[PDB]
Structures are given as structure tokens and as C-alpha cells.
Write a protein that binds this DNA or RNA. Structure first.
Ligand SMILES: [Mg+2]
Ligand SMILES: [Mg+2]
Ligand SMILES: [Zn+2]
Lengths: 136, 176, 128, 125, 37
RNA sequence: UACUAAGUGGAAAAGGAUGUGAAAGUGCUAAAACAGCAAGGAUGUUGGCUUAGAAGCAGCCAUCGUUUAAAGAGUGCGUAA
RNA sequence: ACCUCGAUGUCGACUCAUCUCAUCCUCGAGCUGAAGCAGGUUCGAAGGGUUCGGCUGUUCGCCGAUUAAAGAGAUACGUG
């Protein structure tokens, strides 16, 4: 479970994710990366699921890199309560993902293996993914 | 492509008079008719002992018909000159059958008696009381009657009992 | 055609060739004849099956790569090829290849060397 | 490439220009052991037996200036046996090799610049 | 018959066709039949 | 002038799809292409660990050389071996 | 907190039911670690039926005996 160790403020505002991928725009470490095609909030649980899927389908031959990270917190008012009277508590961290950010990338393993690993991981994330090869 | 494949219409007895929507194929075994559809895009031209069909256009439906009717003409020709057959092995314990004139009967595990009308233009023959061989002029009719016979007791993987096509390898399953 | 590894010193307790219509009693004497030159070894034999219940048999050499353990002087090779446990001279490989010539379908003695070179590498043995 | 094909044709054409026998055989019913067994019997290193595609054989024979030899390689699977010097033994070897096996065809060929037919193979053997 | 929303071949010989505006798949092993998308 | 075969028009997602049109590349191809059909698809190996029984197939260990037009210490199916 | 506070009578039980199908049986079919009997899952199908009692105001539930079945819901949590 990816999580910041400690922060300054516990209840930050929501961060928008409708842009054109400020930062993390291009692959930087592997020869194949995963790129979203529709920005959305993806929480730490999905991140861990994708990470463990890639790890399990990778093997002891190559590496995998994670780019995004759930910095922003998120609140959720408890069940069965009228609104007002303050703000709810933080429940789950979430990594903001703008449309067009490389977020997962692997290397040092056969090509069809990158294809199958990234496709295996992409079905756990809500965003509509897309396979991208590293530039020359 | 099958559509542009030379049909070798041998002038033994096969004569092919073409109408607007009728193709009357006749031979030593019996006349065979093919009901053409309205506005068929194929063009039928026959030379001396040579038949060839051509497409006016390149549309998908015409492309399909170019092969379907080539195959149908070839099948009708080979049937009218030779005649098709299907071979059934009716294998079992109490499984047997025989012919009473126009109506074939079957004897299976049914407590009920099974009888099956042989249609026109078809001939059945039972070499061995558990062995059936259907003989006919058109592949469609003989295949239809073959599957009609088969429908009464389908083969099962546990035991070879049932109606089996000749030259068929049925799967096997072992139940203790 | 059913191949079997009948022992060279013994041939008498048995039935899986009896369903072939082989007359077991008439061939047991033949197995103990030509094989008597290499007693104590398990000799493979090809069995053709003629329609007339006539039969002709071809004996073969003891299995390949077993001899490589003896030339290496070590009872067992490495489980990992990168670990060069043993080494064998190219001249000693010549002695081994000659024994296998009847089994080997190799066209030349020089090619017969090359066939044994792919077996020596399986044991991780260096070819010197 | 065009160059690779031309080299293969030229090499084959040059070989047929010095041969004393070219005999055409169907490769039907020939096992892997049979392929090695027939070659092994051909023992002496002056003869070859190879399955060769018809289009190569035809161009090679055409450029070696052979004629009426098209029928041997016409519409059929075509291995070739080509020997050097005493060529008669090679024909007997292949003739006794089929006979030992289940079957094999022996279409014909050229012996010392002379066409022979399938029926004439037995005469030579 | 496996009515599954995402049909994909499982065997090597599992061929997928489109019969009556409905994609399907046929294999010699009857354990791979699928339908409906 | 094109596209659509779905009443799409005349409601909607993740995902699946030889639907179909267009464009840009790229491979083979008339010394014959792809598919089908007819042949063969081999040797050292029944390598060893191991299972009454594992020897190409219960699994596991390096998993390659040779003959040859061709070929996996076997494509999968399929055997107590 | 949008209609009704110059009144929209709210649980359960009885009577009468009607409708949906995400089907409980009857009906058709595919697969199976489906020998047969008996099953499990899935597809099609709403024509008809879907018990009687003890306890509790009870819906709900537990229990008892049954039947092919004792369906899931909706109708101002149908119906003064
Ligand atoms: Mg009022
Ligand atoms: Mg009242
Ligand atoms: Zn399959």
C-alpha cells in the first residue's frame, strides 16, 4: 500500500484531473509504458493491484517503474448523517492522473511480455489505457 | 477464388438450358432443377464442353453468389452424373433397422416404434441389419435424410452406442 | 514395430510382445546368443513385425552420455552448465564416438565427433 | 533475391553440364532413414541425391542445353540423382533401394548425353 | 454454451464467427462455446 | 457526391469483435504467391532426478549437437511406463 | 426539503387481486470432474399454480408436517 508517511494538512481540497498531462507526459525509464486516455482519480488500492499484477506476470528477469503516487488525500462523510457541521475525515489516498500520463513502465524482458503485462495491469485501472513504446 | 473456376461440363448426358430463373440440369440418373433468384448478378456463359460464370460488378453479394452458384452447378453436375451417398453405422446392443417399401423403420431403446418416411428421389439400402447406406441424387436431400435418421439417438461419449457417420472419430469419456 | 530394452543376460519372464503374435519361446535363445559378447548390460532391441510372423532383430549400443561420466572420472555432472566441474581431452572423445558408430546415423567420423560434442556440453564438461 | 536465385540456377546448370547421369525420381514414400540410407549406399563421393524443386531443375536443364528432358520433371515431385564417371552403378543402387522399400517411382533421365525412359531404368539396373 | 460478454479464443483451433449478428466461437472441445459479444 | 444495413437515426459505460469505408506504410507474388490436398517431419535419448508404473508428455534438471529438402531432448493431442 | 399542516388517516391481519421477470415448479436447450438415478451452472420462457399449523401485534423469523413448487418484487411499503 503506497501512502505518504506524514503531511502538513489533513483535509486538502480536491484536485482537478481534466487537463493535458502536466508532467509525466513521456516514457522515461522503460521501452514500453502505459498511458491513459481519460483522466480520472485512481486510488492506492488500484495502484497496488496493478503493481502486484505486473510483478506476478513479470518474473525474475526485468524491472518495473511506477511514476504516479497518491499524494492527495480524500474525505468521505460517514454513513447515515445529515450534512453540515464540519468536514468529514480522510479515508483513502488517491493519485491524480491527467489524460496522457505515463504511469507504469517495465523493461528487460521479451516484447510480447511487455505487451501482455501492461494489458494485464490496465484492466485494473478505471482509466482507458493505451500502450506506448519508448522513443528512439 | 472458386467463383472463376472452370467447370468441365462433359457432354455425356449433361445438358444445361438456361432460363430467366431456371437451370434444368438433366443426365443419366435424373433431371435436377436450380431455382435462380430474381436479378441474379452473375452472368452464365457456356462454351463447347466449357462453362464459366462472370460477375457484372464487384459488390459483396455478387462476389458471394459467384462462388455459391459455381459450387451448386458443380455439385448438381457431379450428382446427376454419379449420384451421392451417405453411410451410417447404426451400432448398439438392441439397435437395428430395416426397410418396408417406401417407409424405413428403426428399432432402438425406445419403448415406442419408430418409422420414417423415405422421400421421393432417395433410395436406402441395409447391407447389415445394423448398417445403413442412403443413396440419392442431390447432396442436400441425402444429407437432410441422414440427419433426420440421426436425430433419434445421438451418439454419446461414454459408449459408442448411437447413430454414427461413417469415418467419424467420436470422443471418449470414462465414467466409473 | 515395438522397441524394448530387453536385458542381454536374461530373456524369459514376460508377455507384452505376445499380443503381437510373437512366439516368445523361439526368440529367447536368440537374445542370449549375439548379446553374449556384451553380457551384464541392458541392450535395446528394435522389433519389426512381419505379417507372416517372421521376425528379424537389430541390437544397439548402451545409451549415450553414460560413457562421458567414465571419461570425466566423475560419477555425476553439474546441475548447472556454467559450473565447469569436469574436462575431457578431444582424443578421448574419439574413443567414445567410435563405440557409438553402430547406433549413430552420422555420415563421417569427423561428424561423429560433432554429435558427441553436443552430448559432452550437456554434462557441462569442457572440450580440450 | 534475384542474384541468389541466379547463383543457384548457374551452379546447378554448371553441374548438369559435367554430369554423366541425371535421373529423375518421385520423392514419394521416402522416409528420413531412407533419405540417409539411399545416400549412404550411394557410398562413393561422386554422386548426389537431392530433392529439387521443378522450376530450378527446368531453368538449369534449359541453360545446360538439355531438351525433351522436361517430361521427366513435368508435373511431378522431382528428386534428382546425378553421378560422376561410372554412372551405371548409381542406377542399380536406386533401383534396388525402391524394391527394398514399399515403393518409389523412377521416371527416367539422361545417361551419358542420351535420354532414356522409365521402362529403360530396369535395363540399366 | 457459455454466455460471456467478452468472447475470445481459448484453444489454438477455436475460431470465432459471427452468426445471426451474434459473434460466437467453435472448437472441437465443446467446453469452449461462447456467445453474446 | 459519398457512408450506413443497424430502424443506426430514434438513450449510456468498462470490454469483445475477419462488420464495413478511407488513407499511409510494409511482406510475398507469375523462375507460382497464401489456403487446401499428396509425401516426409529423423539420429545421439528410454539423457539423468522419479513415480510397481514416467523413458517426447506426472513433474523436474542444462535442454543442445548431427544426417538431411526438412525437423521441437518434440506442435499439441494422447499412453501405468 | 420540491408538492400537501384553512388535515394526503400511518403497521399488521382479512377480502379481491393486477403487473414485472432478475424463474420456484411444470416446458425446451447447451456444458459438466453428466456411467444410470440424482444433480450443478447457464440460456429461452410470465400460460397457470405457488400449502396448512405452534409462538409473536407482528411483518421478518424459528419450528413441525407436507407438495411439483412453498419464487423474488411492485401497485400512496396495492387495498378503512
Ligand atoms: Mg382541504
Ligand atoms: Mg370503515
Ligand atoms: Zn478450444
Amino acid at each position: 500500500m503506497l501512502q505518504p508517511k506524514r503531511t502538513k494538512y489533513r483535509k486538502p481540497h480536491n484536485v482537478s484531473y481534466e487537463g493535458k498531462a502536466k508532467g509525466n507526459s513521456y516514457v522515461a525509464f522503460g521501452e514500453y509504458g502505459l498511458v491513459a486516455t481519460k483522466g480520472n482519480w485512481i486510488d492506492a488500492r488500484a495502484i497496488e493491484s496493478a503493481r502486484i499484477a505486473i510483478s506476478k506476470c513479470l518474473g525474475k528477469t526485468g524491472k518495473m517503474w511506477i511514476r504516479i503516487f497518491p499524494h492527495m488525500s480524500k474525505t468521505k462523510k460517514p454513513l447515515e448523517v445529515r450534512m453540515g457541521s464540519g468536514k468529514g475525515n480522510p479515508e483513502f489516498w488517491v493519485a491524480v492522473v491527467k489524460q496522457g500520463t505515463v504511469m507504469f513502465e517495465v523493461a528487460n524482458i521479451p516484447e510480447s511480455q511487455m505487451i501482455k503485462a501492461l494489458t494485464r495491469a490496465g484492466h485494473k485501472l478505471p482509466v482507458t489505457w493505451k500502450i506506448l513504446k519508448r522513443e528512439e | 477464388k472458386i467463383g472463376n473456376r472452370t467447370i468441365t461440363l462433359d457432354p455425356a448426358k449433361v445438358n444445361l438450358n438456361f432460363q430467366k430463373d431456371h437451370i434444368a440440369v438433366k443426365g443419366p440418373l435424373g433431371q435436377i432443377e436450380l431455382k435462380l433468384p430474381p436479378n441474379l448478378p452473375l452472368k452464365f456463359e457456356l462454351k463447347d464442353n466449357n462453362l464459366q460464370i462472370t460477375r457484372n460488378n464487384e459488390l459483396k453479394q455478387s462476389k458471394i453468389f459467384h462462388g455459391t452458384y459455381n459450387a451448386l452447378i458443380t455439385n448438381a453436375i457431379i450428382g446427376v452424373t454419379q449420384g451421392f451417398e451417405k453411410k451410417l453405422r447404426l451400432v448398439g446392443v438392441g439397435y437395428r433397422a430395416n426397410v418396408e417399401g417406401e417407409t424405413l423403420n428403426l428399432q432402438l431403446g425406445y419403448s415406442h416404434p419408430i418409422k420414417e418416411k423415405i422421400p421421393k428421389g432417395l433410395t436406402v439400402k441395409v447391407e447389415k441389419n445394423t448398417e445403413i447406406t442412403i443413396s440419392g441424387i442431390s447432396k442436400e436431400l441425402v444429407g437432410q435424410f441422414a440427419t433426420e435418421v440421426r436425430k433419434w439417438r445421438k451418439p454419446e461419449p461414454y459408449k459408442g452406442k448411437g447413430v454414427l457417420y461413417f469415418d467419424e472419430v467420436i470422443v471418449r469419456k470414462a465414467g466409473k | 514395430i515395438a522397441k524394448i530394452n530387453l536385458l542381454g543376460g536374461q530373456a524369459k519372464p514376460g508377455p507384452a510382445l505376445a499380443s503381437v503374435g510373437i512366439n516368445m519361446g523361439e526368440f529367447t535363445k536368440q537374445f542370449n546368443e549375439k548379446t553374449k559378447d556384451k553380457q551384464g548390460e541392458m541392450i535395446p532391441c528394435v522389433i519389426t513385425a512381419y505379417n507372416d510372423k517372421s521376425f528379424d532383430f537389430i541390437l544397439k549400443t548402451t545409451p549415450v552420455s553414460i560413457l562421458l561420466k567414465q571419461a570425466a572420472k566423475l560419477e555425476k555432472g553439474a546441475k548447472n552448465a556454467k559450473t565447469i566441474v569436469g574436462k575431457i581431452t578431444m582424443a578421448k572423445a574419439k574413443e567414445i564416438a567410435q563405440y557409438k558408430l553402430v547406433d549413430l546415423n552420422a555420415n563421417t567420423v569427423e561428424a561423429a565427433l560433432k554429435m558427441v560434442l553436443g552430448t559432452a556440453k550437456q554434462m557441462g564438461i569442457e572440450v580440450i | 533475391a534475384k542474384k541468389d536465385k541466379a547463383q543457384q540456377v548457374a551452379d546447378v546448370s554448371h553441374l548438369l553440364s559435367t554430369s554423366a547421369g541425371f535421373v529423375i525420381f518421385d520423392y514419394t514414400s521416402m522416409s528420413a532413414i531412407e533419405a540417409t540410407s539411399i545416400r549412404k549406399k550411394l557410398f562413393k563421393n561422386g554422386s548426389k541425391i537431392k530433392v529439387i524443386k521443378n522450376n530450378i531443375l527446368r531453368r538449369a536443364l534449359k541453360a545446360g542445353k538439355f531438351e525433351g528432358i522436361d517430361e521427366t520433371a513435368i508435373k511431378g515431385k522431382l528428386a534428382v540423382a546425378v553421378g560422376v564417371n561410372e554412372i551405371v552403378e548409381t542406377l542399380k543402387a536406386v533401383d534396388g533401394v525402391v524394391k527394398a522399400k514399399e515403393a518409389m517411382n523412377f521416371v527416367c533421365g539422361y545417361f551419358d548425353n542420351r535420354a532414356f525412359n522409365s521402362a529403360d531404368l530396369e535395363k540399366i539396373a | 454454451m457459455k454466455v460471456r460478454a467478452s468472447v475470445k479464443p481459448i484453444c489454438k483451433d477455436c475460431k470465432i464467427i459471427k452468426r445471426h449478428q451474434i459473434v460466437r466461437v467453435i472448437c472441437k472441445t465443446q467446453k469452449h462455446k461462447q456467445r453474446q459479444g
